[PDB]
Amino acid sequence: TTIVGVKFNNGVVIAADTRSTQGPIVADKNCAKLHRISPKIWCAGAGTAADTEAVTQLIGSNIELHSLYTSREPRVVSALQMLKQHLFKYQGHIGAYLIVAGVDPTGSHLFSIHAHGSTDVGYYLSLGSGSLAAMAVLESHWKQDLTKEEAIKLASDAIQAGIWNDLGSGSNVDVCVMEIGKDAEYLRNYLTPNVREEKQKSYKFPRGTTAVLKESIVNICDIQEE
Amino acid sequence: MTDRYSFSLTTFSPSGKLGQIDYALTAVKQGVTSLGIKATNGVVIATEKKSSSPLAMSETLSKVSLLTPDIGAVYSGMGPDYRVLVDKSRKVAHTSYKRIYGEYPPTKLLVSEVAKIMQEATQSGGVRPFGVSLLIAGHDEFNGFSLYQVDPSGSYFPWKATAIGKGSVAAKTFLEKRWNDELELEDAIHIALLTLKESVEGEFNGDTIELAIIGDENPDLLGYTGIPTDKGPRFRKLTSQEINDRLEAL
Amino acid sequence: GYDRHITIFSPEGRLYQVEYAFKATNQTNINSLAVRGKDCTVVISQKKVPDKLLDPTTVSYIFCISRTIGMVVNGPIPDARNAALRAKAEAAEFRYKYGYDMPCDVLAKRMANLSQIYTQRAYMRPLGVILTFVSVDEELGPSIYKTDPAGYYVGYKATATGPKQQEITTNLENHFKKSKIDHINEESWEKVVEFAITHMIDALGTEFSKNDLEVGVATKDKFFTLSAENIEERLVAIAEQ
Amino acid sequence: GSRRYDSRTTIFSPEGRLYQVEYALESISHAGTAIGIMASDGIVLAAERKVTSTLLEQDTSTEKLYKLNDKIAVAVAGLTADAEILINTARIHAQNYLKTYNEDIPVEILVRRLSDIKQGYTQHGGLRPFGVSFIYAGYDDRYGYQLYTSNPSGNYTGWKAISVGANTSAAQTLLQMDYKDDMKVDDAIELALKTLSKTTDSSALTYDRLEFATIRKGANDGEVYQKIFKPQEIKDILVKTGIT
Amino acid sequence: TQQPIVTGTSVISMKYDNGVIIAADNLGSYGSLLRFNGVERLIPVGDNTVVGISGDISDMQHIERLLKDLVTENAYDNPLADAEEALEPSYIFEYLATVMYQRRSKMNPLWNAIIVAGVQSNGDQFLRYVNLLGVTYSSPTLATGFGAHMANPLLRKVVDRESDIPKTTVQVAEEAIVNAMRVLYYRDARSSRNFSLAIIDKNTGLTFKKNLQVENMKWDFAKD
Amino acid sequence: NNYDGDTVTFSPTGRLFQVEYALEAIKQGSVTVGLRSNTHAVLVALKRNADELSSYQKKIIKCDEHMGLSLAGLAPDARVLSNYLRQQCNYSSLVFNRKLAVERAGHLLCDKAQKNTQSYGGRPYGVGLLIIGYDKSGAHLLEFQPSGNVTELYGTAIGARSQGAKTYLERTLDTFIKIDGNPDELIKAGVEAISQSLRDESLTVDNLSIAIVGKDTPFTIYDGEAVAKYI
Amino acid sequence: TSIMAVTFKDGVILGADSRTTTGAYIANRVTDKLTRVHDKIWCCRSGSAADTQAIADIVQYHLELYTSQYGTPSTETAASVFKELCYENKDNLTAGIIVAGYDDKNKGEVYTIPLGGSVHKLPYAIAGSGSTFIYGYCDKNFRENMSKEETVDFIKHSLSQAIKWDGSSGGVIRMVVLTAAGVERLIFYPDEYEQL
Amino acid sequence: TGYDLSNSVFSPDGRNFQVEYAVKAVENGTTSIGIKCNDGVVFAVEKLITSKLLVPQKNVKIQVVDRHIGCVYSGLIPDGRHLVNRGREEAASFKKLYKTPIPIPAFADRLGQYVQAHTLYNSVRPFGVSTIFGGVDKNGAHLYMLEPSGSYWGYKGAATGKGRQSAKAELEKLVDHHPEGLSAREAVKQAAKIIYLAHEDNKEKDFELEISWCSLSETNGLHKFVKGDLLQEAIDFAQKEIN
Ligand SMILES: [Cl-]
Ligand SMILES: [Mg+2]
Ligand SMILES: [Mg+2]
């Protein structure tokens, strides 16, 4: 997994690859790692995939209720505080490593979070097995006062570094841009540089190839009238 | 200390009446009128913003509340009781449904959960019943548009159109003459404004009336783009200006 | 007639214990007033020290709940301090859990919800107090939110509480009918305090010395109370025009 | 302290009656009449909704007839909210039994369980009883088609034909007169509707004031089907039996 | 179960004709790092008792707070708190011994070795030991850690049995204690030059000496 | 009247009637006397029988080697309170190697009784106690009331007709306080004190109960022929 | 971590490096290890980042609630709250915290709370992995009642050496100055302190 | 009616009658006072000698909390002891967490909230005592008085019990005649006089005087009982003034 977060002029961008693995085997080739905590607060997760997904939805649920209770749009610092206290209580047993980004009435924010509960602030961050490849690109090309177009370019370039150089990462680049005073734009499969080539042969079988012992209709309908 | 009231405060009288529930319904009767009308392509719920003082900012007091993106609620009776019920209803929509099925509950089942909470305050130890009647409007994929009334006893009924509180008897008669199964949402809003004018004494404008609809999906109110299946909330609260525009065509 | 002793419905759908808690609210015979400026929120309250053996510096019904939120109370001091301690605990917990300062309106709602519970649960009595919360909110600006024993709460452009609330309320209403704006159009908080004291003098028909008043001021990022000498400077400016 | 305000819901009268149970039964006598009739080839459940309105959405409305599982249904007379609490508990019990034994719960076992819950509220806890009487219509492979009733005391009994709610004295006399053991479902449908038509406090019996259900082995071969009648289907059976 | 982090070394003590003497150095070690150089490990309780503590310093500070609370509590509703109903050395020890044994029984010990030195109401000398296991014992001389191995042999040459106590003056006893502290500084790698010494006498009361140093040392012979 | 249904209710004049009714149970109880010098402390108690076939109800209970009490009122309540004193004396000895001061024992009894006067559901204790003891500050005598009030005295009496013995001790105050180092004479004074409360009946061998504690005397109870010497 | 706090004539100054480490990988090179628990009571954190952040957030909550009830807390009080959390949860924590604060009555004060949860009041304190290499330097160069400029130089030079020898320490040197005048943040970059 | 049968019930006036009945028990008790001086506080109390058999100086009424706070009360003595026991727990937990001894205003609220809590439910009875307490902290001397309702304020002088009106009048004279302040030793003398003067409301039985004080200069900010020569000197000063 490769995930990054990059601050720019009027907001923040996060990105991620789309490969999920089970040991050396690729379980899903087009996985969605960019999660929504609230409309304008998004996070990307590395580590135990069920934990990142579950902890995001729990805090996202409680954030929604909090927003309704207070009649205010949710803040990134609230999501951060709730995430870190939950993760600290479970002493690292919930294996969620997250980059949390978003915009709120206070401004634009970018944080990272580690399974034990420690948090970090930054203008640029990376997490996952491909984080070193990504951070190499970020440390080479990041500057202050990036534009929206420059930040999207830098973020996706950092994910590409993970895709090509880290075996734990691959396939496509997902991006989400959160700009102040605008709707957050989720760009699913922003880049697609890994389409499989046409196979040499068709493996469609002639009908009747498989030996069959018994056939029967399965009743999926409910008990009938009359 | 400790709560030593572990016994019921609502009990059957010799005539079979549950006194505390009847008295709660009396409190609802004294409350300000609220109504609901169902159309073919939407539902409307409305009430009067009876401001306690002109120095009070009545926009900070919400009588019509979003429960889920596709479900809204209004009341007649005791305001504070309503406020805590909205808090509980919002939470139970998540804890007993969204955290299980990954989607918001259908209108009838959220109504069922709110009803259960109100029933328990009628039987549990050391509590009184809630002094409110609720009107809950909503939409969901398989049931379409719907409107429900929930009473202090916990009983709930589905309506095409209805009214509760102060002038409910007169308002329900007014709605019976005007309602048909071919109404469009704008027609239902028009009828809602006509019906509500009868029970209002003083000022009748966008600042003294609270009105919300369950209608089309509002992608402009979603807060993000990029997911085709997410198209936005069907609950929308009408602005002061939007109400006044429809009061000229009244 | 035990429907009058605990918080259950009477045959008229009324809660008598709640109504009687509203009456306890005026037991101190003190009137309070709150107004909003451009950048500030001001709250003033009468101060009465009837015993010469009392230490007058310890007699107060204004509380500093958090750095940003202030609270004035109308009602007996034991119930006032009960509510004050709880509000302080709630505000501190909120900041710890959600990472930002508890808004004035949110604290008001929370205390109103707690009050609602006392009207529904039999073993708990209502508190005989009305709580007026003030701040300069980072999102909503100058804010006044008031809670009562019924569990009701709402925002205010300005408000008044006490035995003579109606006289003060009507006086404030008439001013805002003239100006046609939702606040006191003044730059400094000093002049907003002067407005508040002047209009209380007009409404009650009484003059005040420095020891007859108690003043709280909310600005961006802090709420504070004025000393007797700060109030004296305010009274001198009022008399000189 | 708190003793002062305690009504003491679980005490005997000097005559050996349970006050709250008796008063809850008084409440139920004002509820809409529900009737159950058992035939050789099925069971009928018929019930009257209480004074309705033209603006009530009938096709999505349910106040009388509830499904507990695919084989068992109930007719309600009393506080609807109280009934739904018990109904949900009964639905869970049926599923618990199915999970444990991998067989559908026998009708009487479900009825006994709900009745025991009602009994508890009359002996301990100091809470008011549930103001509900049920008619249980169900089928299992031991006793076949079965009708039961339970009331706030937690007592339950089996029946060939029975009524609960309003005018049960009049209704039970009419059923006792026309019921026969070799009766069929179509005949029982007619008896149930005729009995409601005579006992009703309304001026006339129409489709919008009724809820109707049948449990038939009129399901294709050795299996049982529950049919909760739609508003139009209640209108048709009223014309067929010659009431409208 | 834990491990000691910041630790204090030997506490040494002995009886003499009119009272008791107790001593301990002012170091708080962090493993082999001699981290804290101004730590007081003798804690007086009233004017008749001095509690000397070795082992974990965080647990020592906890015990110090317990003793402070004990004095406060004893004064409550007690008109004779500074007279007949004052805290005795024997009361203070038994309380500590109870706590130590209870804590080891919950598998969560206070990682210390403690010596309570004092004089009772009737003038009797009190000297008793307790440690992290709740083990207790009394002797004319007592010492913890390294002191047990090096100080006791020297102090036992002065008072070898009970009958030697009346024959031992305060000057002879203090001299012996001071010499033992020098020997410990020569030979214990977790000791310091600076130490505190306390004398509890039935006639002259509690004398608490701070900022004492090991002096008259011999190294010269190292030039060969 | 309307304010005596439970212990949680003040009357309009600020009285607690359930506590006052509990006090009344003591007045129905048999007389018992307490007195002390500077070396010893003595309890004398008139035991009450049900009839001529029955035994005489025991009145004196030992709490420790240096402390004990006599009772008047509900005997089972005295058993509960004396058991608590036994435990507190015991806790002091085990944890602090310290004999529990008589004054501190009084404070503990006061606080235990108080909790039963301010809470719903409970009831006040229906017994009065006279506690004697010898500790580090010499001999002591305490009087306990179930209201919670505990008082340190030179001498006193509780129970039916206790006023006669109390007046006698008030006269004899200067004499019996000086009876140091003579246990027999101090008991004589106590037996003479309790005699001022007798009517119709006199002190017999199975009627009289005496207890003593002092400088070199553990708390010991005398019954039967052991008190014939004082009859 | 290389962290330290030093009292001087006008108050106290806290200093720290900016390196956060997961093994040999620098997970954050611009970390802020100087943490505010009250207006003029700050702390330096070392050990587990999760633990010291959790503790500092709880202390900030405790002192915010203290202030609402009893007014401004003393530095000693803040140190006590830190100690209570560190001592009672010693089995489950890996935290070494230095607490520094300015009162007007007490002026500048420094308390160090090592692993066990003990408290030690000192004129100055050093902690973290990098502190081992500057025990000699700091002991030789510390004086009481230094000026602001002298104390800044002492901390700058000390942490410079700690960074030079400890691989776990590095990045920028941050400082926070606590006096009657207020709160001042300072930052010093590698090109400055490496040439010292 | 019936509003006065249960605690925590509001009457139609908005009053808690059970709390008002607790005040009657306080008014029935012996006189106790408190005087705030230049650098501390003085407490004094009237002890009625019911009988010659009472051991003099033994039945001590004034109670210490921590080492710097003194407490005295009038009314039901056991209720006062229960309140002081709680106060001692509150002071211990404060010092445990925050290290510093509990400030007097902080301690005042702890007692206040606890007493107020006994007006919230019908399952408990209000306290039948008014408590005068105080001491020295980092901000100087403080004197407080706390009523059954939970209400408390700071005082220059305070009095409660059967002879409170007499005592209050005497305290008011001292406030007027000494705007600059009163010394600790003067306050002890004055406290003796006021109790002797207030004993006219309890003139049937004779009494025993008990005084305590906390002063920055005289007791190092610790609570101590006035004993021996200093007590006798105050008794003599008091006896001289009544004659
Ligand atoms: Cl809430
Ligand atoms: Mg209540
Ligand atoms: Mg380095």
Count of CA atoms in the C-beta half-sphere (13 A) of H211: 29
Residues 6 or more apart whose Cβ sits within 8 Å of residue H104: H69, H134, H135, H136, H137, H142, H144
Residues 6 or more apart whose Cβ sits within 8 Å of residue G138: G4, G124, G126, G154, G158
Specify the DSSP class assigned to residue C150.
T
* Residue F70 burial (CB count, 10 A): 27
Q: Residues B144, B215: contact at Cβ < 8 Å?
A: no
Work out how many domains chain H is built from and give that number: 1
DSSP state string for H187-233: HHHHHHHHHHHHGGGGTTS-EEEEEEEEETTTSTT-EEE--HHHHHH
Bridge partners (DSSP) of residue G49 are: none
* Sequence-ordered alpha helix ranges (H) in chain F: 17-28, 75-96, 102-114, 162-176, 183-194
A143-155 residues labelled b (16+ CB within 10 A) or e (exposed): eeebeeebbbebb
> How far apart are alpha carbons D145 and D44 in whole angstroms?
11
The amino acid at residue A138 is L
Q: Among all ligands shown, which has an atom nearest to the Cα of C86?
A: 1
Q: Residues C121, C6: contact at Cβ < 8 Å?
A: no
Going from the N-terminus, what domains does chain F have, and what CATH number goes with each?
A: 1-231 (3.60.20.10)
Q: Residues A119, G53: contact at Cβ < 8 Å?
A: yes
Helix (H, G, I), strand (E, B) or coil at D24: helix
Specify the DSSP class assigned to residue C58.
G
Nearest to B18 by CA among D165, D22, C122, D24: D24
Q: Residues H23, F14: contact at Cβ < 8 Å?
A: yes
Tokens of G35: 């943490």
> What phi and psi, each to the nearest 5 degrees, are found at residue H159?
-150, 145
Tokens of G179: 């006096």
Handedness of CA B133, B139, B141, B143 (dihedral sign): positive
Nearest to E84 by CA among F102, F132, F141, F94: F102
End-to-end, the C-alpha distance of chain B in Å comes to 59
Q: Residues G106, G75: contact at Cβ < 8 Å?
A: yes
Residues 6 or more apart whose Cβ sits within 8 Å of residue E122: none
User: At CA H229, angle to CA H225 and CA H231, rounded to 5?
Assistant: 45
- Residues from chain F that touch H85, judged by Cβ atoms under 8 A, are 111
Length, in residues, of chain E: 224
* Mutation to test the G interface, candidates A110, A118, A119, A127, most G Cβ within 10 Å: A118
Q: Residues E34, E197: contact at Cβ < 8 Å?
A: no
G67 is catalytic: no
CATH code: domain of residue C97: 3.60.20.10
Nearest to D153 by CA among D123, D177, D185, D127: D123
> How far apart are alpha carbons F3 and E95 in whole angstroms?
47
Going from the N-terminus, what domains does chain E have, and what CATH number goes with each?
A: 1-224 (3.60.20.10)
CA C46 to chain CA centroid, nearest Å = 12
Specify the DSSP class assigned to residue F49.
B
Tokens of G186: 């300072």
Q: Would you call A71 an interface residue with chain C, using a CB distance cutoff of 8 Å? A: yes
Nearest to E20 by CA among E115, E135, E154: E115
CA distance H71 to chain D (A): 31
Going from the N-terminus, what domains does chain D have, and what CATH number goes with each?
A: 1-244 (3.60.20.10)
Q: Residues E89, E119: contact at Cβ < 8 Å?
A: yes
Q: Among partner residues E2, E57, E59, which is closest to G91 by beta-carbon distance?
A: E2
* Residue F4 burial (CB count, 10 A): 15
Chain A residue at shortest CA distance from G28? A120
Tokens of C61: 């019904």
User: At CA B246, angle to CA B240 and CA B247, rounded to 5?
Assistant: 85
Length, in residues, of chain D: 244
CA dihedral (E60, E63, E65, E68) in degrees, to 10, reads -120
Tokens of H82: 């229960």
Residues 6 or more apart whose Cβ sits within 8 Å of residue E222: none
Nearest to B47 by CA among B56, B58, B129: B58
> How far apart are alpha carbons A179 and A11 in whole angstroms?
4
> How far apart are alpha carbons B221 and A39 in whole angstroms?
10
Helix %, strand %, coil % of chain D (to 5):
40, 25, 35
Experimental method: X-ray
> How far apart are alpha carbons E26 and E33 in whole angstroms?
14
Distance (angstroms) between ligand 1 centre and the Cα of C152 equals: 13
DSSP strand pairing (D34-39 vs A96-104): unpaired
Q: Residues B196, B48: contact at Cβ < 8 Å?
A: yes
Q: What's the Cα-to-Cα distance from F110 to each of C26, E92, F68, F103, H80, rounded to whole Å?
A: 40, 27, 16, 11, 11
User: At CA C7, angle to CA C4 and CA C13, rounded to 5?
Assistant: 75
Helix (H, G, I), strand (E, B) or coil at G171: coil
CA dihedral (C197, C201, C202, C206) in degrees, to 10, reads 180
Specify the DSSP class assigned to residue B18.
B
Q: Residues D48, D191: contact at Cβ < 8 Å?
A: no
Chain H residue at shortest CA distance from B1? H123
Q: Residues D130, D121: contact at Cβ < 8 Å?
A: yes
> How far apart are alpha carbons G2 and B222 in whole angstroms?
48
Tokens of E70: 């004990």
Q: C148 is in which domain, residue-wise?
A: 1-241
CATH code: domain of residue H197: 3.60.20.10
User: At CA H213, angle to CA H210 and CA H215, rounded to 5?
Assistant: 165
> How far apart are alpha carbons D207 and D196 in whole angstroms?
12
Kindly state the greatest CA–CA separation across chain E.
68
> What phi and psi, each to the nearest 5 degrees, are found at residue A209?
-65, -35
Helix (H, G, I), strand (E, B) or coil at B23: helix
> How far apart are alpha carbons F34 and H57 in whole angstroms?
20
> How far apart are alpha carbons A129 and B102 in whole angstroms?
29
CA distance C63 to chain G (A): 9
> How far apart are alpha carbons A140 and A124 in whole angstroms?
12
CB contact under 8 A, A226 and D223: no
> What phi and psi, each to the nearest 5 degrees, are found at residue C22?
-60, -30
* Sequence-ordered alpha helix ranges (H) in chain A: 49-70, 76-89, 131-141, 148-165
Q: Residues G74, G38: contact at Cβ < 8 Å?
A: no
> How far apart are alpha carbons B178 and E178 in whole angstroms?
108
* Residue A89 burial (CB count, 10 A): 11
Q: H126 is in which domain, residue-wise?
A: 1-243
- Which contiguous run of DSSP H or E holds residue H237? helix H228-242
Q: Would you call D5 an interface residue with chain C, using a CB distance cutoff of 8 Å? A: yes
Residues 6 or more apart whose Cβ sits within 8 Å of residue G148: G8, G9, G10, G13, G177, G179
Nearest to D164 by CA among D27, D34, D74: D34
> How far apart are alpha carbons D130 and D152 in whole angstroms?
6
* Sequence-ordered alpha helix ranges (H) in D69-228: 80-101, 107-123, 168-178, 185-199
- Which contiguous run of DSSP H or E holds residue C130? strand C130-137
Nearest to C115 by CA among C103, C131, C97, C135: C131
Count of CA atoms in the C-beta half-sphere (13 A) of G82: 34
User: At CA B242, angle to CA B240 and CA B248, rounded to 5?
Assistant: 105
Bridge partners (DSSP) of residue H75 are: H129
Q: What's the Cα-to-Cα distance from A156 to each of A166, A173, B203, D134, rounded to whole Å?
A: 15, 7, 58, 65
- Which contiguous run of DSSP H or E holds residue F208? strand F208-214
> How far apart are alpha carbons E27 and E29 in whole angstroms?
6
- Residues from chain G that touch A114, judged by Cβ atoms under 8 A, are 49-50
Handedness of CA D226, D231, D237, D243 (dihedral sign): positive
Burial class (CB in 10 A: 0-12, 13-18, 19+), B11: buried
Helix (H, G, I), strand (E, B) or coil at G73: coil
Count of CA atoms in the C-beta half-sphere (13 A) of A192: 7
- Which contiguous run of DSSP H or E holds residue C142? strand C141-147
> How far apart are alpha carbons G98 and F27 in whole angstroms?
67
- Residues from chain G that touch E58, judged by Cβ atoms under 8 A, are 87, 90, 116-118
> How far apart are alpha carbons A90 and G50 in whole angstroms?
12
Handedness of CA C2, C6, C8, C11 (dihedral sign): positive
Work out how many domains chain C is built from and give that number: 1
Nearest to E64 by CA among E48, E81, E52, E47: E52
Tokens of D64: 């009388």
Helices and strands in chain E: count of H runs, count of E runs: 4, 13
* Sequence-ordered alpha helix ranges (H) in C180-226: 189-204
- Residues from chain E that touch G132, judged by Cβ atoms under 8 A, are 33
Which CATH number fits the domain B1-250, given the four candidates 3.60.20.10, 3.40.50.2300, 3.90.440.10, 1.10.1240.10? 3.60.20.10
* Sequence-ordered alpha helix ranges (H) in chain C: 16-24, 77-98, 104-120, 165-179, 189-204, 228-239
CA distance A135 to chain C (A): 29
Q: Residues C156, C192: contact at Cβ < 8 Å?
A: no
Count of CA atoms in the C-beta half-sphere (13 A) of F93: 13
Q: Residues D210, D49: contact at Cβ < 8 Å?
A: yes
Place of tokens 């102090």: E155
Provide the angle, in degrees to the nearest 10, between the axes of the packed helices H104-117 and G49-70: 80
Going from the N-terminus, what domains does chain A have, and what CATH number goes with each?
A: 1-226 (3.60.20.10)
CA D26 to chain CA centroid, nearest Å = 17
DSSP state string for B116-181: HHHHHTTTSBTBPPP-EEEEEEEEETTTEEEEEEE-TTS-EEEBSEEEESTTHHHHHHHHHHH--T
> What phi and psi, each to the nearest 5 degrees, are found at residue E219?
-135, -25
Nearest to F203 by CA among F192, F213, F189, F187: F192
Tokens of H180: 């600059």
> How far apart are alpha carbons A208 and H124 in whole angstroms?
86
* Sequence-ordered alpha helix ranges (H) in F60-212: 75-96, 102-114, 162-176, 183-194
* Contacts across the A-B interface (CB distance below 8 Å): 40
* Contacts across the C-G interface (CB distance below 8 Å): 21
- Which contiguous run of DSSP H or E holds residue B177? helix B168-178
CB contact under 8 A, B2 and H123: yes
CA dihedral (B59, B60, B65, B67) in degrees, to 10, reads 140
> How far apart are alpha carbons E73 and G182 in whole angstroms?
42
> How far apart are alpha carbons E135 and E101 in whole angstroms?
8
DSSP state string for E132-154: TT--EEE-SEEE-THHHHHHHHH
Burial class (CB in 10 A: 0-12, 13-18, 19+), D159: middle
> How far apart are alpha carbons C198 and C35 in whole angstroms?
12
- Which contiguous run of DSSP H or E holds residue D39? strand D34-39
Rg over alpha carbons for chain D, rounded to the nearest Å, is 18
Burial class (CB in 10 A: 0-12, 13-18, 19+), D217: middle
> How far apart are alpha carbons A76 and A5 in whole angstroms?
14
CB contact under 8 A, G116 and E36: no
Tokens of G148: 């602001």
Handedness of CA E150, E153, E154, E156 (dihedral sign): positive
Kindly state the greatest CA–CA separation across chain A.
76
Tokens of F143: 């009087």
- Residues from chain G that touch A91, judged by Cβ atoms under 8 A, are 92
DSSP strand pairing (E194-201 vs E19-25): antiparallel
Burial class (CB in 10 A: 0-12, 13-18, 19+), G12: buried
Active-site residue set of E: 1
Q: Residues H193, H238: contact at Cβ < 8 Å?
A: yes
Residues 6 or more apart whose Cβ sits within 8 Å of residue E162: E140
Helix (H, G, I), strand (E, B) or coil at F43: strand
* Mutation to test the E interface, candidates G76, G115, G118, G133, most E Cβ within 10 Å: G118
> How far apart are alpha carbons C186 and C40 in whole angstroms?
9
> How far apart are alpha carbons E209 and E24 in whole angstroms?
11
DSSP strand pairing (B224-225 vs A184-191): parallel
